[PDB]
Subunit: 222 residues, 8 copies
Amino acid sequence: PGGRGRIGVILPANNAGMEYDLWKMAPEGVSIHSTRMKPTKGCEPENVEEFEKELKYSYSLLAEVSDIIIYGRTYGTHKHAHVIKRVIKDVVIPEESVYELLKKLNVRKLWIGTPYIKERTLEEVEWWRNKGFEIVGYDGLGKIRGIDISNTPIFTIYRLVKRHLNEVLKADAVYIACTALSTYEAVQYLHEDLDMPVVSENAAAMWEALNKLKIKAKLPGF
Amino acid sequence: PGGRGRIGVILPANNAGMEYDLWKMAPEGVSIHSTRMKPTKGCEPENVEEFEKELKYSYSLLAEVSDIIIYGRTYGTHKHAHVIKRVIKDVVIPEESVYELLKKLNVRKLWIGTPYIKERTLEEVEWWRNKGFEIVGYDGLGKIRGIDISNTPIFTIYRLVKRHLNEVLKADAVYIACTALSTYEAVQYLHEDLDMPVVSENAAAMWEALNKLKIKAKLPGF
Amino acid sequence: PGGRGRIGVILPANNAGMEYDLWKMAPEGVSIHSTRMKPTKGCEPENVEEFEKELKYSYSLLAEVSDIIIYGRTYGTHKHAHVIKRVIKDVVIPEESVYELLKKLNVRKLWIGTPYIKERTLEEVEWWRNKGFEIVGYDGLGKIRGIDISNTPIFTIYRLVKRHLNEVLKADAVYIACTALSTYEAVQYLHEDLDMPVVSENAAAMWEALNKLKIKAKLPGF
Amino acid sequence: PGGRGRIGVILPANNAGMEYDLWKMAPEGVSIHSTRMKPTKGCEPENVEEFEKELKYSYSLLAEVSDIIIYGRTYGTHKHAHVIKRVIKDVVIPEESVYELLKKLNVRKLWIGTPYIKERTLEEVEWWRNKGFEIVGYDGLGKIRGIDISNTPIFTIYRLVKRHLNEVLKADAVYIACTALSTYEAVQYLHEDLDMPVVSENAAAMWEALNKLKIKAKLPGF
Amino acid sequence: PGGRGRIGVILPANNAGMEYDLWKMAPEGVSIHSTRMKPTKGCEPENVEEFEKELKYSYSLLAEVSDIIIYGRTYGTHKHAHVIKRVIKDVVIPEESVYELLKKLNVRKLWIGTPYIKERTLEEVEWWRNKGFEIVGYDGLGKIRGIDISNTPIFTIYRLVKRHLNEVLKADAVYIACTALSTYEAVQYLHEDLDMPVVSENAAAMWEALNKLKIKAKLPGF
Amino acid sequence: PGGRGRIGVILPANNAGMEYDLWKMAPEGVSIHSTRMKPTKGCEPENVEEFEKELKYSYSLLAEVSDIIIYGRTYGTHKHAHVIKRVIKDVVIPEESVYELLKKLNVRKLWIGTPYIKERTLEEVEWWRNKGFEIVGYDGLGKIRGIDISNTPIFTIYRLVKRHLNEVLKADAVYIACTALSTYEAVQYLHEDLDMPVVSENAAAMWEALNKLKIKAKLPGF
Amino acid sequence: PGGRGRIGVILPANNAGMEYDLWKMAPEGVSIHSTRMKPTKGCEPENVEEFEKELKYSYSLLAEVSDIIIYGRTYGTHKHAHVIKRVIKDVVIPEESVYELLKKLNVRKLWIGTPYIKERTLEEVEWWRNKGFEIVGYDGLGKIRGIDISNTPIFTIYRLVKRHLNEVLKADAVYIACTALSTYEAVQYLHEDLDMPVVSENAAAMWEALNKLKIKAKLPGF
Amino acid sequence: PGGRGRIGVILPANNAGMEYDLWKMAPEGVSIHSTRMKPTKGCEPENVEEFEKELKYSYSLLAEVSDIIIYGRTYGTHKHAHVIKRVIKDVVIPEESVYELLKKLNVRKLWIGTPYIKERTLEEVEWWRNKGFEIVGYDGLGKIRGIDISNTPIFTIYRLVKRHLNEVLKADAVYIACTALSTYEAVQYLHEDLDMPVVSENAAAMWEALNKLKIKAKLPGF
C-alpha cells in the first residue's frame, strides 16, 4: 500500500522494461500501478476520437489508485500531446520530462542513444535537434519489436554509448530514448564513467512524477 | 528485464495491494507485468460472452510479455473458473492456489480472516467448508471498497487474526482472503507468532506461479 | 542503566505513542522512565490545589531515577504552566519546546496538523497564531480518545499533511500536535519529501531534554 | 503503536533497570508502557485494603493501553499474591514466572545471585529452597537502595556469579533476583560461559508475558 | 601472491569468459595465471608434433608460477588427450572433470546445453551419450566465434536451458559446454530453480583443480 | 564478460603479482585477459626483429578480446619503446604511466623503492633523475628471480619504504618499481601513513588504461 | 606480527586498563607489546640509580620487538623525566603527550577529571595549572589501588565529568588523568556530547606514538 | 577492563606473535596482560634457584591483574615443568595444553610443523613421539632468532605444511610448535583446507585458559 504515494502508469502491451525501472526507482512507501494499451501500427493516432476514447478508458482504470499518472508510450506524444493532457490531468509525458530535466541541467550539446533502426534514430535526432539541442552524435540498437527492445542487457545499452566515446565526450549529457529499455543500471554505469548526466526516458519520467508528488528520491544517472 | 521469468497479472482497477506483494515476493531476475479490468457490480459475470470477450482482450495485452499469468480477481472464479481457464492457458487462479497449498500442507482445521463485511465473510467461510475444511473460526474487516481494502495497515491485518487467538490456535493454518490486501509483512509476523502456516491469497498465487515456472523462492507465511 | 542519562516522563494513562517515540529517539546509554496520571475531563484543571497535589505525587515517583523530566500532557499547560514549572524544577513542556525549536529555526509561516476534531484544531491554530506565527493552513484527524489517537498509522499521519501539499509548501515548517501520536517515522518521511523542518511534539520534547542534559543526538524531521 | 502487542508494567518508583531490559527484549511491533508506585517501607503491605486500592488505581492507568500487565515488584508477592491476581486479571508476577521457567527447564539444583545484603539474600534463599530446589550456593551485592541496585554494571553482575564458579558449576541453572537489575547483557555472557540456563527475573517475566500474548521472541539467558 | 595456491590456465586467444569465472570462484589466497594459444581452424590438431611443441611452450610459460594447470580448450582433448597429459603432468582437462563430477553425483540422465550450432551441438551430444549417459534433451545458442560466445549474457544462458523445462526436468543434472561461456552466475540461478546439479565446464574444472590442491571452496551449481 | 571493458595484459612468464593487482583494481564489469612471453636474459632485446616478431604474436593473441592492452614488462621499454608502440596501437607502458601520473601530481622530489639489487636499483634511480626528478632516497629488496619478487609479502614492501622514513618524508611521492610486486595493499597502507601519493607500477598502469577506456575507478595509493 | 608497526609499553604491574585501550586504538598491522614494573610506594624515585637500573632492564626486554616505546607510568615523570628520556631514546611519556596535544588544540581553559582522592586530584590540578592552563574545574573518583582504578566502568568515568556540566562547558577541553583508566569508549561519548576535545592519557600517548611512527589512525575523543 | 576475564601471560622478550594471537582470540570482555622475561641461552635453566626466583618475580607482576596465567615459553617446560607449576598455581603451559587438546580430539597420527632448524625440529618430533603419537611427517622454517620467527607471514606458515600435503593427509591432525608464531589466521586456512584439526601452540594455550575460566569462545584450527 503506497502510503507515501501511488504512481499509475499506462504503457504498451509489450513493454517489459519500464515497470521494472519504475519499481527499482520507487522510494519506500511508493508503489507503481499499471495498465496496458493495445499495440499500434503507426507512431501517431490515425483516428483521434478512437485514441481519445481508449485513452480515457485506460485512464479510468488507474484514476482511483493513482496519485499521478505517467503516459509511458511515445505513440501520440509528438502530434497529439494535447489530447493526452486533455484526458489525463497532470499526466507525465516522459519525453517532455526529458526536455525539462535536460534544460534544468543546462544542456546544449547532446548525444542520443536509441534502440531503433537508423531511420527512426535519425527522426529521433531531428526531433531533439529541432528543439534547440546540438546533437554531437547518435546511434541505435536497430530493433523493431518492443519485447526485443525490452530484452536488451544492461551492458548492451552501456556499449551502445561507450562505443562512440570520443564524440559522446563532446556532449553535455547523453539521452537514451524509449521506455521499453530497462536503464536503471546502465545509466548509473554510464554516468559514473562519462562523468556527465546520462538521462534515460524512464528516469526522467520518475524525476517529474516524484517532483510533482513531492517525494524525495535519488534517481539514477544524474 | 525478467531474464529469470516474467509474471503477468490481471487485476481489478482499484486493487492497490497485489502488485506490491507480488514484487516484494519476486525473486531476483523476475518481473511483474499487470493490466487492469473494469470494476464490476456483482461477484459473478451476468453476461458470459461479455466477460469472456473482455477477459480475452486483457489476456492479449499480457500474452507476449508473460511466461505465466495470474488472474488476480475473485470475480468469475466461483462459477465461471472454466471460462477463465479456457481463455488463459495455464492461468493461475489464486483461490485455487490456496486450496492446493493448504492441501499440500495437510490442513484440515482452518481459521479464515477477510476484509469483507459479515454477510460476505459468511459466504467466504461457507465456501471453504464446502471444500472439506473444518472452520474453527473467522472474522472480517468489514470493508466494501477495494481501495479501502488495499489501504489496510500491516498490523490491522495482524490484529484481525490475533484478536481471536483462542479460536486460531485450534486451526492447522490461517487463511487471509482477497488479493487487494497487502499481506507480505502481516503474514510473516502471524506465521512466526502463531507457529503455523498463515496463507494469504497473494502468497498462494506466487507459490503456484513460481512452481510452474520452476523458480526457487521463499514465500512468506508458510 | 542510563549511564549516559535518564529521562523521566509523566504522561496520560491512555497515551501509547510517546513512550515508543522517546525510546526510538533515545541515544545509546539513555533510558526513558515513565509514570501515568489519571485521565481528565477538561483540558485544564478546575481544582488547582488538586492538580498540584497529584502533579507533585507523580513527580515524586520519578524524581530519583530522572536526570530531567518531561511533562507529556497538554492538560494544564495553557493556563497553568507556572504550576507545573513550580512543582517540577527544569521540567520540559513539549509545547514550549516546539516554540523554542521553531523560533531557533527562524519559522514565521506554519502549517499545523493535529489528531483532533474541528473545534479543538481551531483552538490549536489560534494558540499558535497568538504566539506570532502566520498559519498558512491546517487539518486534523478528527479523533477524540487518546488510545485511538495513539493507534494512528505512520502514513495516516503522513497523508494528513501531504493531502494539503499546496498550502504546506507555503509554510516554513510543519507542526504536528499531540504527544499521543507516534511520529518518529512519519516526521522523517515528511521532512525528506517536503524539504522543510517537520516538528512533532515528541521530537521537540526530546530536543529540549537532550539539550539540557547535553547529550548528542539526531532527532527526526529537522 | 504496538500493533504486535502492548505490555504494561507496574514498577517501583526507583527501579531504573526493568524498563530498559523489557524494551531490549521487546520484539518488533511490541511496546512497553509503565506506571510507578509509591516506594514502600517493608516488603509486604501492612494495610491490605490500602495496597489493593493503590494497586487497582495503577492498574486502571494501564488497563486500556495494555494487552497484558507485568507486576514488576517483589512487594506483596510473597504473602499477598492472591490480592494482586484478584485486582489484575492475567497479571504476570515475575517471581512466579521464574518458577515456571525453571520447572519447564527441569531444574533441581540452583545457584542464586541477588543484589541484596546477607540478611535478605538469606531470605531469598530459603524461599526458593522451600519450593523444592536444592540450593548449591548463593551470594549478593549487598545493596539496599533500588537506584543503587539499578546502577549495577553488566560485569559486576557477571562477576557476582563467576566468582563462585566452583559451586555455580554444580547447579542446573542460575537465578538472578530483583527486577531493578538490568540483566539483558549479563545474563547472555553468563549463559554462554557457564553453558547452562541463567534466568533473570526480568527475562522470566518477558518469557511469560510473550507466551500468553503469543509473540515469538528470543530471550536472554535460556 | 597466491599463498594459498596458484592455478595456471592455458586458453584460446579469444576466450573472454573463463578467466572471469575462475577468479570469481577462486577462494581467498588463490590466484589465477593464464597464457593464450594461437586460435586454430579445426577442433583437433592436424600436426601432432606441431601441437605438442606449442603446448610444451605455453606450459613452460606457466610451469613456475603454477601449482597446477588447467587446459582450458576443447581443441585436442577428444583424440589427443594423451598428448596433453604427457606434456603437462597432472593437467586438468575440464571435459574430463565434468565426467568425474557427474559420476560422483550419480548422474545417469543428462540434459546438455551448448553455445554451438546444430551440427556441433549434435557432436557434443553423442560424445557424452557415448560415455553412457542417457541424453534426455539438448539445445545450443548457435554461435561460432569464441568472442561472440564469451559475450553471452547470464540470462541468455539461463533461458537456453529453461526454455526446455519439460525435458530438462527429466534429467539428473544439466551440463553446459564450452569454457568460453561465463557461467558463474547463470549456473547458480539454474541450480536453485531446477533443484538439481547444473554443471558448467568452468565450474567442473575448478572443482577438480581445487580438489587436487586441497583448497576448500564452494563452487557454483552443485 | 567485461561488458564495461576488457583489459589485455602481456607479461613475463614468471610474473605472479600483476594479474592479482589488476583484478583487485578492476571495477565491476571489467575483466583482465593475459598472455605470457618467454623469459629473457637481458633487460633489452639484442635481436630487434626477433623481439618485434614475438611481440606481434602475443599481441595477436590478445587483440580480439582486448579493448586496450598493457605491456607489463620492463624489457625493451627503455631503448625500444617505439617498437612496442609500433606493434601495439595505444599500448599502455606502465613505466610511462608512472611518469604521467607523477607529473599530473606535480611531483618534483621522489623516493624510489625497488625489489632489485644495488646495481639495478642504481640504474632505476638514474633513469628517473634524468626524467627530471630529484631523488631524495632509495632502496631495494635485493632480489633477482621474478617468482621470488612476486612472493614479496605486503608488509615486506611496506617496511622496504618505512625503514627510510626520514628521507621518504622529504619526497613529494614514493614510487615502487616492477610489476611483479603485488602492491595493491602495501601502497594503501603507505599512502595513508605517509600522507603522500605512493605510486606502484601496477596502479599507474591501471590508472592510464582506465582513463583511456573512460571507466570510473578508485586506484590505491593516490 | 606488527608489519605496520610495533609499540612497546612499560606499565605498572596492576594497570589493567592501558593495554586494552592501546589495542583498541591500534590500527591494522600494529601490535602492542608490554612488560611490567614492580609496584612502588611513592610517586617519585627514592633511589635514582635503582630506578635507572630497573628502567634500563625493562627497556632491554622491549628494545628489540619495539619500534617505539611508551612509558605508561606517572612514577618518576614529574621530577625524573630526564632519567627516562636518557635510558629510553624517543620514549613517549603520556603526560607530555597530553601537553603537546592540548597545545596543538589551542587549549587555554581546562577541566580535569582523575581517579584519585582529593589530595592527589588537587596536586594534579596545580601541576597543569603551573603549566599555564586555566583550570575551570575538576573532580576525582577518590580511588587508591590501581586495580580498583582499572575496574572503573565506562559510564562511571563518563558521569565523573558530566556531573559538573555547567563548569565543564566553560573549558576548551577536558583531560582525564591516569593510564590505568580504560577511556577508549568513555572519551568518545564525552567528546560527542560536550562537543569539545576530551583527552585521556592513553589516547594522548597513542597519538604521539602513532605520529612518530607515521601511522594513520583516528584516535578517540578528539 | 576485563569484566569477563583477565588472562596474564609471561613470555620471552623477543616474542612478537603470541600477544597478537591471544588478543585476536580473546572474546569480548576478556583482556590480555603480559610481562617479559630475560632472553636465555639454552632451552633449559642451568641454575634452578635462579630460574625459580626470576619466575616468581615475573609472576608477582601479573598475580593481581590476572584471573589465570599462561607461561608462554618453551624454556624450562621439558625438564622443569614442576618448578613452574610450583611457583604459579594453575599456570597454563601451552605445550601441555596441546597434549590435552590432541588427546581430547582422539589424535594418534600427527604431522608436526615448526619454525626451527632441522636439529631442533628433530628433538621436537622425537619429544611428541615419546608421548604416544605416530609422527607421519614434519618440517621446519629453519629459523633461530625469535623476532625472525615472529615475523613469519601467514601463508609462509601455511605453505610450511601444505608443501607436504601427501604426508599431512595421513595424520589425524597437524601441530604447529612455538608461541612466537602468529598462527591465528594460518591455522584457520589450514583447518578448512585439510579438513582436520590444525593445532597451534597459542590456540591450545587459549583453549585451556578459557576452559579453566569458563568463558565461551571459538578458537581457530579445531
